Design a protein around this ligand. Structure first.
Ligand SMILES: *[C@@H]1O[C@H](CO)[C@@H](O)[C@H](O)[C@H]1NC(C)=O
Ligand SMILES: *[C@@H]1O[C@H](CO)[C@@H](O)[C@H](O)[C@H]1NC(C)=O
Lengths: 111, 227, 225, 224
């Protein structure tokens, strides 16, 4: 089992903003390793929407920021300007996209 | 009190298809009755040049005139004259220009390198690199096309040419393009057109699919046993 | 007594870099003191051309006139007028040509096809075939380079632009290149530049080696006891 | 005053098997009740040359003379003459045409090349090229069948026989066919038949489908 732990189910109306915290065991790898928030699509894999090194995707440009509180032991993803393409299945995680170390947030926007 | 004239560069004759030549004037005040002219070797007429620059704050003025020319006839080494006579300098001066004949004409050999497999692992962004090596003189002009229509210049970054140290006085350059990674795992031909004045038809074009580094054979050999 | 004004083909502006247009006069009476010349729309002079025609092998006279222009002058919208002066002409003839602007432009999609495996089994010679397609107008050019140093035009054979079946006014062409069988089984990159006046830089090119495909071969080998 | 003769070639025979040879009369003024005839070496008579055409509104001349012959009198070397008499030239004009023997015959190698992966990866339409190389003399008939059912000739396009670069007196030709690539994903049959005179049975058929030159990938070699 993978020790990240986020919010399992998030609900927020279009136009409003989301803050999603995900926790990690505050090691000295996990403080400094790459922290992502990828969109698990259909037919395959994570497509990293906003990494923590400084990538921010074409979609989430101007509307998302991922920060990292390593002493608090957590990292937080703020996403403003939701729409109904922001619904679906997301992962908040650490390290590489493929190798687990993640948690599965299910973002679900309402009208 | 000086005049700087700029010759037409191959990264501009190729980009704008309109070989032309400018004349800016440094350290001369913002006065009227300006002399800016462009003549051939024989001194005949030229394109009507307008769009004079603005009066700079420190009492200096650069009346820039842009005049065109037939295409071969700049490369044939025909001298041009920017003749100046201001108010402060009623004595003229002819800033002359020519095509620098001379230095050897070697051609680039362009290798386009695909992204590292350690980079398409984070699933963030791929940096494809065009390594325009081995050429002479300077003024290469690299631009990038996807499937036929050229990309924005906001996405690729060409270095200025740097001289190569092992070989004699022949330059190189490079130019990276950073694409999304989901755009690259789709396919996406992404070619690198490199304009020089020493190639046969002036343009070389190389390309990279997703499937260009991929190994020829996987060769596993599994020996499960109980000893 | 028939004067044609030959327009410069694009496959000659590209091959020669030196756009020349030629006043061709046929069936003149057998005489001398011939005066032929090329002018713009403004009637400005061009130089006198060298290499005059000879008399007809059909017992008459003919004239050729070779004027080299700037390409921007020809394509910029300037019509061009030829003058011919002979014995039997009571007055000279001014023959007019203009670059026929008004054709839709489309670009070739060069797919370079590699030789069939049925052919590299007779152990003789491959024909790589450069399917230029989809384009409009005519006046494509196709030439073949091997490592940036072009092959002689005795080795490749370009077709003529023939109208495409399914699409509207559009064309294709081919060009075959036949290369002997131990050449292609060494490497030998064989690129195929295609020169057309609807491309961005007027030239595209594609290339094909021995290994332009030939996919991942898995070779599993289980010794499961 | 020209009289041409358009003969039947292999493409014209083999499409129809009903060899009709045509005598064209051109370059006169517009007179009516034209007098033309199609005669053999021994001066006999043939089928009538009905279907006279219209004349020319640019005031040149138009008359055709046909005759349905069967093949062996066209290959054995009987010269066939169109005779022309009229009001402008009321002298008997002879236009002779036959099959000019005295040429070699080599057999066409046919290779049917499947569409390239650059073309298919757009997924718009694929074109398959039948390459009819190496042969001599000219006049080959390339046509295409989709599993024993001949495709409509608005779809393929045959070239003309252009002479081969490195081969001495030989030729080649091409014929492209534009399949909608959605039909190539089912990848049915697409055979190319090529009718020449130097084949044994005069018809060669080649075929290509979606999986023809595909090599074997998954070489599983389990050992015990
Ligand atoms: C494929 O695997 C077999 C069995 O393991 C091996 O003997 C053979 O050499 C391999 N083929 C190659 C390397 O081409
Ligand atoms: C396929 O596997 C066989 C089994 O040993 C091997 O001998 C052969 O080399 C392999 N062939 C190829 C083309 O890899």
């Amino acid at each position: 089992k993978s020790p990240i732990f986020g919010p399992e189910e998030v609900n927020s109306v279009e136009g409003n903003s989301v803050s999603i915290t995900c926790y990690y065991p505050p090691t000295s790898v996990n403080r400094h390793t790459r922290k992502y928030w990828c969109r698990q699509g259909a037919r395959g894999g994570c497509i990293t929407l906003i990494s923590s090194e400084g990538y921010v995707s074409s979609k989430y440009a101007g509307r998302a920021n991922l920060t990292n509180f390593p002493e608090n032991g957590t990292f937080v993803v703020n996403i403003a300007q939701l729409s109904q393409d922001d619904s679906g299945r997301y992962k908040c995680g650490l390290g590489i996209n493929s190798r687990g170390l993640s948690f599965d947030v299910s973002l679900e926007v309402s009208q | 009190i000086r005049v700087f004239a700029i010759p037409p560069s191959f990264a501009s004759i190729f980009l704008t298809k309109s070989t032309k030549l400018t004349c800016l004037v440094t350290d001369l005040t913002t006065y009227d009755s300006v002399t800016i002219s462009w003549t051939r070797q024989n001194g005949e007429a030229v394109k009507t040049h307008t769009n004079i620059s603005e009066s700079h704050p420190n009492a200096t003025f650069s009346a820039v005139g842009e005049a065109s020319i037939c295409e071969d006839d700049w490369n044939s080494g025909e001298r041009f004259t920017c003749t100046v006579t201001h108010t402060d300098l009623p004595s003229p001066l002819k800033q002359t220009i020519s095509r620098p004949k001379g230095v050897a004409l070697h051609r680039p050999d362009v290798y386009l390198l695909p992204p590292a497999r350690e980079q398409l692992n984070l699933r963030e962004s791929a940096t494809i690199t065009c390594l325009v090596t081995g050429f002479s003189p300077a003024d290469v002009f690299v631009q990038w096309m996807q499937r036929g229509q050229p990309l924005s210049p906001e996405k690729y970054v060409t270095s200025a040419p740097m001289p190569e140290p092992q070989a004699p006085g022949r330059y190189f350059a490079h130019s990276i393009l950073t694409v999304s990674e989901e755009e690259w795992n789709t396919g996406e031909t992404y070619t690198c057109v490199v304009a020089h004045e020493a190639l046969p038809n002036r343009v070389t074009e190389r390309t990279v699919d997703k499937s260009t580094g991929k190994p020829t054979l996987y060769n596993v050999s599994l020996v499960m046993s109980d000893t």
